[PDB]
């Protein structure tokens, strides 16, 4: 439907029969792509406008299964258990850079990649209704036991089950890449064609699928990983066995299961699917507790487990990956909200795929037109489903058959608050309705955000700014989009320049005096500095670290903001930017005070931008304060200021960077991309005339160099190496 890519110059190699394909990702960067193009490489792309793909060469053969653990970059690398997990973390996620953490198994066939790490989240959304949400009742947190937590922290591995035999996999590696692996074969023998139903409430792992449905005994290997001082003591507790219902039905006999997933709800959910020759029955088997009904013997121990049917279907079925990589439980009364709660997509090779809601398996919409795993909660498929070497396909991420605007806004803000709390990246941009649902949505969202923070605003501003910018970006509102990024950059600059203070003793937090300076005079900052403080504002004699290169940004931004005031008649609401809030203006004035102190201490101040200011900083500060006085606390704004800003010295430059991000406007119909050949529809140096460095780009706008060729400004580097303003997916781009 949308974002349908294609391969440029690779084929299936007709004489070669076939190959298995499987890719799955919970977090962003949703590409694994084990494909049979003409032991093949692994493909990775971060679906936030990634189209150009980086396929790093695999190390093993046939690459059967993959399922990423969590947010942090980590691959799976199965099919004969060689060349396993690697974090990438080198310059960008453009270079995978396989590492040394691989397990070993002689001609094994591992078909699992697991070891859930931290506690699950519980989404009490049916009873939330966003009214008394306060981010507490809307997104709760259930208590979950972590697997073999020493002392504190749950060190995790990739406990898996080979298909060669049925033994185990091992080798959790905490803090030293120490292997410590083992093997114990689940009562000495067994063939398996299984998936793995990972974790129960406590610390345990269950899994079973062995031969075929015609005679299908499945022995639930209940292992425990409370290890040893370095000797994994995994056990082989055997739970009851279950069969496929297709047997006891005397109508047919062919079931022959191939896929048989059972999701992470390892207390009620077993979804073994029969892969019979034209049709393929699918059944979901419960894990219900029961007691044996001892009776009928004569007139005159509840602990026992059983598996009972829940529902079934009679049709074809080929490919299905997962239900929803979270949801709610019983007693949900939300009927109008058909949002992706308890649903599971599954593919057919004969025609189109089907969507199905779990726990009844009855039916959902069909959405006409290999590996189909949901991108997130929002219903976003992936289209490897084979008619050739076809690329991704997607569908409507909002599952609404009847149209309701207010409920749609509610679901969208729910998903946004979810991606905010959990920290995941958001791809609900494909879900939001036409711009009629754009501005009011983010307005109500940020209102509820600032309302019931109560102090979470201080820790969530850096994310809410980027979220708002990304929401208003989708139309027209691009001005409001650039304003948010320009506010975020200056806010993080202000919050990073203060703790840089290696100051002298003070009464209470000498860094706070720069903020308390609000009650000061308007003009002649030279008086304001003597008023507040002048001694404890010199931290390093090597001020030549950020004053000439980094502090030029604010020195030009103040001027660009002053020049943009008398040009409101421009064909744009703010022109370039408006910034009539006042708080940002106050932070700007504080930055001006501290930079004036810096320039007084050392001669490497911000430039006059040409020359000949008779004290350019003095005039700039006078104008800032004249604009700031009638902005502070609920007052009208601009007189003489409009005439003063009209006067331009022999100093004023223009043409500022203003880092913006291209969008992906696949509006409502279709798209046709390619593996390459992109389809047309930051100031710390970082930009010579022609690119001649690393140029490690980012997700939206950054495009910063990797080494930066500096001495003591590594604070920004360490701040930016990790995740970023919803652009933590740093990317390497050649010259």
């Amino acid at each position: 439907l949308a974002y349908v890519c294609e391969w440029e110059k690779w084929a299936k190699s007709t004489y070669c029969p076939s190959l298995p394909l499987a890719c799955a990702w919970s977090c962003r960067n949703l590409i694994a792509f084990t494909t049979d193009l003409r032991t093949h490489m692994i493909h990775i792309l971060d679906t936030e406008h990634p189209w150009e793909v980086h396929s790093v060469s695999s190390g093993h053969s046939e690459a059967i299964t993959c399922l990423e653990w969590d947010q942090s970059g980590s691959r799976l690398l199965s099919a004969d258990a060689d060349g396993q997990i690697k974090c990438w973390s080198m310059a960008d996620h453009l270079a995978n850079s396989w590492e040394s953490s691989v397990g070993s198994q002689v001609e094994g066939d591992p078909i699992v990649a697991l070891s859930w790490l931290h506690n699950g989240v519980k989404l009490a959304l049916h009873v939330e209704k966003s009214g008394a949400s306060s981010f507490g009742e809307k997104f709760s947190r259930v208590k979950f036991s972590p697997s073999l937590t020493l002392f504190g922290k749950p060190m995790e591995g990739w406990i898996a089950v080979t298909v060669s035999g049925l033994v185990t996999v091992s080798l959790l590696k905490p803090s030293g890449q120490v292997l410590t692996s083992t093997e114990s074969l689940c009562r000495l023998r067994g063939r398996v064609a299984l998936a793995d139903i990972a974790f129960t409430g406590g610390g345990n792992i269950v899994v079973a699928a062995a031969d075929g449905s015609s005679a299908s005994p499945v022995k639930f290997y209940k292992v425990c990983v409370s290890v040893v001082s370095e000797k994994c003591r995994i056990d082989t507790e055997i739970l009851p066995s279950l069969f496929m219902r297709c047997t006891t039905d005397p109508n047919r006999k062919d079931r022959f299961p191939a896929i048989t997933h059972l999701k992470f709800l390892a207390r009620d959910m077993s979804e073994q699917v029969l892969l019979c020759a034209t049709s393929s029955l699918v059944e979901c088997w419960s894990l219900r507790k029961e007691g044996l009904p001892v009776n009928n013997i004569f007139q005159q121990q509840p602990m026992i487990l059983k598996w009972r049917i829940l529902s079934a279907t009679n049709d074809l079925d080929r490919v299905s990956a997962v239900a929803l990589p979270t949801n709610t439980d019983l007693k949900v009364a939300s009927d109008t909200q058909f949002y992706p709660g308890l649903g599971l997509a599954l593919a057919f090779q004969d025609g189109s795929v089907h969507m199905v809601h779990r726990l009844s398996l009855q039916t959902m919409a069909v959405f006409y037109s290999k590996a189909m795993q949901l991108s997130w909660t929002s219903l976003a498929l992936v289209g490897i489903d084979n008619h050739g070497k076809l690329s991704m396909l997607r569908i409507s991420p909002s599952l609404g058959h009847p149209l309701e605007p207010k409920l749609a806004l509610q679901h969208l803000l729910f998903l946004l608050e979810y991606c905010m709390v959990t920290g995941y990246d958001w791809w609900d941009i494909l879900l939001h309705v036409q711009p009629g649902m754009v501005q009011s949505l983010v307005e109500r969202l940020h209102e509820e955000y600032t309302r019931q923070k109560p102090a979470l605003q201080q820790v969530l501003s850096t994310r809410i700014l980027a979220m708002k910018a990304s929401l208003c970006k989708l139309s027209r509102v691009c001005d409001y989009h650039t304003k948010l990024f320009l506010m975020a950059i200056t806010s993080t600059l202000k919050s990073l320049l203060r703790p840089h203070f290696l100051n002298t003793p003070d009464k209470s937090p000498g860094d706070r005096l720069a903020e308390i300076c609000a009650k000061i005079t308007d003009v002649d900052i030279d008086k304001v500095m003597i008023n507040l403080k002048t001694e404890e504002f010199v931290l390093d004699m090597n001020t030549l670290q950020a004053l000439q290169q980094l502090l030029q940004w604010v020195g030009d931004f103040v001027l660009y903001l002053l020049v943009s005031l008398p040009n409101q008649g421009s064909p744009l609401r703010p022109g370039h930017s408006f910034l009539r809030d006042g708080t940002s203006l106050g932070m700007l004035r504080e930055l001006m005070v501290v930079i004036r102190i810096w320039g007084l201490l050392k001669p490497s101040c911000l430039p006059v931008y040409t020359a000949t200011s008779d004290d350019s900083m003095s005039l700039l500060f006078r104008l800032l304060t004249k604009l700031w006085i009638c902005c502070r606390d609920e007052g009208a704004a601009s007189p003489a200021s409009d005439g003063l800003v009209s006067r331009l010295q022999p100093k004023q430059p223009l043409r500022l960077r203003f880092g913006r991000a291209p969008t992906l406007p696949s509006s409502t119909s279709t798209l046709q991309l390619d593996g390459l050949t992109r389809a047309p529809g930051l100031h710390l140096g970082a930009y010579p005339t022609e690119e001649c460095k690393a140029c490690t780009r980012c997700g939206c706008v950054t495009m910063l160099k990797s080494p930066n060729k500096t001495t003591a400004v590594t604070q920004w580097e360490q701040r930016w190496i990790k995740n970023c303003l919803c652009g933590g997916l740093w990317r390497r781009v050649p010259l």
Binding site: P17, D109, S164, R187, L188, V294
Partner: protein
Amino acid sequence: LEGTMNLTGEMQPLVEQLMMVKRMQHIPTPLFVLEIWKACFVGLIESPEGTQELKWTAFTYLKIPQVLVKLKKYFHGEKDFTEDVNCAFEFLLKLTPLLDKADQRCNCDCTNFLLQECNKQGLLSEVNFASLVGKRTADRDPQILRAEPTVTNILKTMDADHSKSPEGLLGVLGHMLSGKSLDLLLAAAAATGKLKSFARKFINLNEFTTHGSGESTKTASVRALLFDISFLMLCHVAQTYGSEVILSESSSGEEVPFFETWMQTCMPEEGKILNPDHPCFRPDSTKVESLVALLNNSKLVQMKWHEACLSISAAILEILNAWENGVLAFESIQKITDNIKGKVCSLAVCAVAWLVAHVRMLGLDEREKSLQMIRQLAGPLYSENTLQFYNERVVIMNSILEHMCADVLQQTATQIKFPSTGVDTMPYWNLLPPKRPIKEVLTDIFAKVLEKGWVDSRSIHILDTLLHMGGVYWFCNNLIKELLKETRKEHTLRAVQLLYSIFCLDMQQVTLVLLGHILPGLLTDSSKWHSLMDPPGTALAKLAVWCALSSYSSHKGQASSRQKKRHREDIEDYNMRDPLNRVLANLFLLISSILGSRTAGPHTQFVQWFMEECVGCLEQDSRGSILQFMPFTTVSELVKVSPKVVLAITDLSLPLGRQVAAKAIA
């Protein structure tokens, strides 16, 4: 392989395979006969330990009807088995210590061999060849009821007069002479002419023993003992072979025998999770009440035997009342003596059914094992005067029959209660290490068979177990990986010579998979080219063409445990439309494309060796449809790259042959 894995199927499948391997190899009749005799004599010596030798001897004396049919059909008018058989015997009688060890194993096989030699005189003229046997016996200068080869030879005629008396009050001595002595029925079955014939009438006896109603207590005991012995022998023959008797009972037509215990009770397959509800029919109507009354009475007067299938309902209502209700605690142990004792043999059915039930349920308390051990226990030494005439023999048969099943189960739990109490246990089992990777064929098995070049009859079971425990794809892939590390001509030759044999019993499926997967992957990749430049490449091509020509034959080749696990579906992801038919066309197309010039060093040499190996007599490849088939266009292309062109010269005698004729003229 044909001896260990199977015993039936003697129309001419082994004959066809022997002929096929005879064409594409050194084919002297003396060497061929020495080879078959050496494979016949290397068995029965190192392979069997207990009751397996009684089957090895039946195989050695079934081998000679096979070679007789071969002489009658294969050879005709060219050394008609008068001279070559003698030359091979002299070629065999030279190796004396082998025959010495063979006689030493049976401890009486010298005279037994003397009789087996004159027994082979059905195909060898008694003019002077018997004098060669006399000279060989003279070479045995050194030199006890009877030797078991002689016993089998004598009892081979007992199959023709098995019962031959369909009348009431049958001779109980007919069963006494069989249940007490050795199991000559197994030898008669391995003779390929009794198994289907015996099992049919033997099960018809049980199906006919409905007896209506009987008013005589002695006659009731007679019927009970007869049905018990018959069912025990039938279930023992099943646990011995299985598919043979089951297919003989259900070859054609529709009947109603007691398929309950021969289809869903016990087998080398679980059939247990789906068992209890629909298959294990437990009707409480008019069946649970009588069963409970008989269990509580603690009475075969009223003759009515249909509760054997309904015993599972009684076992259901008993185990829960004994270990979950609480009202019955040890009364179950008392009622167990009412049935596990004489005048009954239905304990095997319930024991198997509830081993199946335990392998499906959790059984963490293991309360079912405490009852199973008491049931299988030989404690009751016929306290009740239950006239059966086989209080010890039938009990030993029942114990060793129950021990044949419930083997994998007792491994998933505490140690076995040792119910059999026999001379020797089952010789054939997994014998797989508890915690060891499956890639042990290259480590121990194959690296040994490459030197130990007689297939190691004990290791062939390990090969079959590994095959159906892993997967044919990785199986063949790892085998080829092990083969492509030889760097010696004779090594590779022996390797492929034994690989073609080890691929048997899975000819079609393994051949298709191996060829159409590896050979493209071997000829399409870049690292795969690096591995085929070796002389092993020629041996691999020879092995490929051998498997292709063998699988082209529409033989049955139904293996014992593979006829069921091969029930899958695949369109193969591309004369008529067939998997092997399509796989061969794909391979020919890849061959023609491998003549795709401008870059190749190995995989031109590989295809050149492959075509040269395909140049051979008795060839049925090069499908050759009159319309558009590429094989002859590919032949012309290869000729561009003299008798090789004459190979596919005149196949259909069509104008297609004119093309290759013209290209050969050039």
